[model samples]
Target: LPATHELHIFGSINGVDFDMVGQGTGNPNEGYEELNLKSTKGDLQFSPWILVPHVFHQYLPYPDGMSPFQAAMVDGSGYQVHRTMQFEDGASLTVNYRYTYEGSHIKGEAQVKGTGFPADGPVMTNSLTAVDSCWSKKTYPNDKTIISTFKWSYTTGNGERYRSTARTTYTFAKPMAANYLKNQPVYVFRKTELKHSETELNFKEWQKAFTDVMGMDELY
Candidate 1:
């Protein structure tokens, strides 16, 4: 159970901190909220978690201004990885992403550039591919800069169905701890949220509670 007065810091990016805090009536129906902070900006609630049908649903369903059949343009299932880029001071930028699917083969790419605007936000361009249980990621300069390779991948999932491997690279700037922390998202279930913690973190309690409720036992 989440403590009433405790604010857990799980991930941070570019000197910014991210935390999961309580919300609503404090029941399973209320869910939780995300708090993101930067140097000047503090306690910014970009979104909230919804919990009406038991499990909390905090997904940002396909962006608006896009057709419902956008996935058909790429493949069949129509669900692809979500990609985003965040800029601090517009001089440098960071790209964060996550891909999900249940489908054959796919390819993806992203391109970024500025319109020579007065350094407010970095210009971002991204693309995605989703097919079967395999995919790849790539980055290019301008639109046609001889393809100064940014990232590459060839991945496949196993039988049980859930598997993912992330390959990342940093260019122009040195790799920092904050860069890695920005990409971590906590997994929430039952009455507790689990993340990379120093202590035991009560994972055994969650596992036992979940399996017991489902009437499941150890696979032998």
Candidate 2:
């Protein structure tokens, strides 16, 4: 809650004995500083997530047109959300990537958990069902669109590392479809029986409220 003047960086090779990366003065509007690193065998890059007054995780997807061997070896580790919480800041939220080897397609899941901000405040934690957004982009005649991409990497137990990339495209909507499912609620005795339409509506409402107040429609 208090104003932050600077952010401290820490790094470790094997998860033991963390070394200081550097110290960066905070600029709330900019959030944090950029920390770029490169070693003999690998490289590390850390940048601010830039959301609200807290730090969130950024998902890195694999590269496009990768070799078969390259695809198999690169591990996404799993999608993770990152945040730091302290007594003054409350509890830190860390993301762990978990992978389950399936046949050809690798099934993935993203999770977020934390004791609400301001340590002494209420504890808030839950698994968000519809947090990740994926979509394809297309351009129409006489229209132009800007594209953005993200790169991510993962390591396997055999010490082999893999990298993959994915892309998303946005299109111009001439006419938006009306939501016929608005205000429609159904009773479900079992949690697993919950309907996707209802959950989607809930997410849409939140998005509307957010965009309305910020007067911005872009999530990136």
Candidate 3:
């Protein structure tokens, strides 16, 4: 079998040749839980997945800080982050993100500004959004395993719009102990290490959909 890391990029997106250099991990103990009733003795009924205990936290991992929870201030108000990086080709990336969870609605909106990354000549702005998920919920983070789509789109110099997407899943029992997790100072389980991302770029993945057309227009 061929070997692979958790996160790796091998090509360029819109002329910006890039490389992802960081650690990514997955929990062997986590997956979609379902029942199995195949080849049983005396018509036995059972479930294949092991019931692992989980504790929910309000905040997701904040990458630009020391700890996940304490650094983000992922409270009842809002969640925001700012990050920047330098590539080998004298290019720079500046990412700004903000998410707000109001009632049952949430938005993970982000802007990627970079030089030599995507636009025509200078730093380009690409918009990103984590659709179909709230920033945080009132209840305990019962999502023992959650998969959310982080989507983004950009308009190249040719006046054409290009949209793309990436994914992130909550792994099994990655622990974190940066003084306060699970409302206490103890080692907790669930997704804690959120570094680079579990994103894989595919061929012909860029779409031409009209992104954020926030109006009621009847299309025939």
Candidate 4:
């Protein structure tokens, strides 16, 4: 049976205070593992905070490329994470991600109005919109493909609009290795950034040596 656990973190990032709560269960003998972090927050006057919930599921990959043991060590064993930011002026931003069978994908969108910014000339009634999507797919052991798209548009107070778009793709011939999830020890906060950059307080380095690291006490 897997054990259930909970975590809470309170700290300051880039001088903005914030808190996070998480909970999950994982046990090797149980044949499956899962964890989720919910209700993340930050303090800011205009865009004071964001809510991000992330979850991971550990299980053997079907159709036969990897065993449960092998998949456990690889990143993207199975996961999805979402973030939403709401501003005082009615603007909003959202980002989402998912990974499975060694494949990964991410998407983000933001919409802002002139009311969100300082009233400067005609810019007050303008609107801004942006979107980004990217993905990396792996075919079994030896091939990988990456693709990305980004677009942005600005509408002037007078109704004129300016827009731009970009797309890119790449392929690799060799197998890609799973990289260790990296974390920094210090919180290096940036004014407009709502994401946490510091190492999660509850994550312990020594736990990486075992398979059950996805459990709440070991994972972050």
Candidate 5:
């Protein structure tokens, strides 16, 4: 069985405070499937200047992407990671990425859409697609650069249809070893504080009273 793993971080990137939240489902035996299974959302605040909100989703169909073993070797899930960045400046960019096993090949497409400030809205849209002709099958510590490509069509908020192609680089942090139990790894991070609401509900009594008034059958 596959289980969902989630990560939530309130950290600083490029000297700006941001929240990075992501979740993915990984199974040692199951291969990659669709984009909705793995997703990331980032909210960045550069107050008095700019605010950026972004999202990423990945999907891999059969025989198109790498296998589970290959994905694990390079710390990837063998799925296309698509991203969209929206800024308070009314500028937005979308990058779609797809990759091959062991970094042997890569492809990507990008779109620059919108203009002015948040209130001013969008104007014109432009896009480009690229494929790496000289991709080397390099992995991990030996590989300095990683590339990915994507192709997709989506609609904008203003009821505009756009087909996009994009190419982008992929980067990874240093690798570390972890303990595994029952096919799951033991990884830990700092705990986040949770805010609690003061109000509470008495669901049992309320349900009973409501059912009695409505002359409906009680649900236990």
Candidate 6:
């Protein structure tokens, strides 16, 4: 198996196209993996601080790496993780959010943060699940796919509100001869949308990892 694996990010954010590129290392046997992403356009980026939680789907090709949305779910259910970012002028933006694991998925909703980040509205429950991570029935051993999506309400610079959602699909092909589940070279397919209304973003991102023995210590 190759030792050099990378992170891929492609989608739109708040109506802006996002194309971020970076690298990652880790997998099922590796326990938990580290990944980072930064946009080439310079307006939005998050990286060098995300870890894909390894539980049941740890073996998925390329590992269904973590997202800032699910960062709150890192160590354990209801656990708190602080994610800090900055503006071009060196200004700071941080969120200390917590996640609660509910059987099939983990939930995230912070106190409607400001500064371009979204806040959770009523009935707007943010979540990440493992349903979308799997072996393609058609491609079988030749390919694997991972889907990640999350939504939040963003308050534009003009003070208007827009519901935002991001969905990304990753493809890992050519399974390792030693392990069929593990593959290589991620093919990223992503999309992000913002609507002027309700929590319909949920349906846009409902598409969706972890390893261990079901109920074990936090993988991170």
Please state every model's RMSD to the true fold in angstroms: 21.3, 20.7, 21.0, 16.1, 19.0, 17.0
Model 6 alpha-carbon drift over 4 Å, by segment: 45-220
Error of 1 at 55 (Å): 20
lDDT of 4 at 151: 35
Model 4: pairs clashing at backbone N, Cα or C within 3 Å? none
Residue runs of model 3 more than 4 Å from their true location after superposition: 1-74, 117-220
User: Tens digits of per-residue lDDT for model 2 on 1-220?
Assistant: 0111211223321221221221112221222222221122232221111011121011111122221112222343222213232222233333222223343233323232333233222221111222222221211222222122322222323443223232222222222112211211111010111112211111011010011122222422
The deviation in Å at residue 156 for candidate 2 is: 38
lDDT of 5 at 93: 50
**In order, how many clashes per candidate?**
3, 11, 0, 0, 13, 7
TM per candidate comes to: 0.18, 0.21, 0.27, 0.24, 0.30, 0.27
- lDDT against the true structure, per candidate, is 0.21, 0.22, 0.26, 0.29, 0.27, 0.29
Instruction: Estimate candidate 1's alpha-carbon lDDT, on a 0 to 1 scale.
Output: 0.21
Candidate order by TM-score, decreasing, is 5, 6, 3, 4, 2, 1
lDDT of 3 by residue, 100-141 (tens): 444323333334444454443322332321112111111113
At residue 146, candidate 1 shows an lDDT of 11
Poorest stretch of ten by lDDT in candidate 4 = 184-193
Q: Is candidate 1 or candidate 3 better by lDDT?
A: 3
TM-score of 1: 0.18
List candidate 5 segments past 4 Å from native.
9-118, 122-144, 151-153, 162-165, 172-220
Better of 2 and 3 by lDDT: 3
Q: Model 5 — which ten-residue stretch has the worst lDDT? A: 201-210
lDDT of 1 by residue, 1-220 (tens): 2111111222333323334322121221233322221212344221111000111111211222111222232234332222222212232222331222222221222122112212121111101111121122223222211111112221112222112233333221112223222321211232223222212111101110111122212210
Model 2 TM: 0.21
Whichever of 4 and 5 has more lDDT, that candidate is: 4
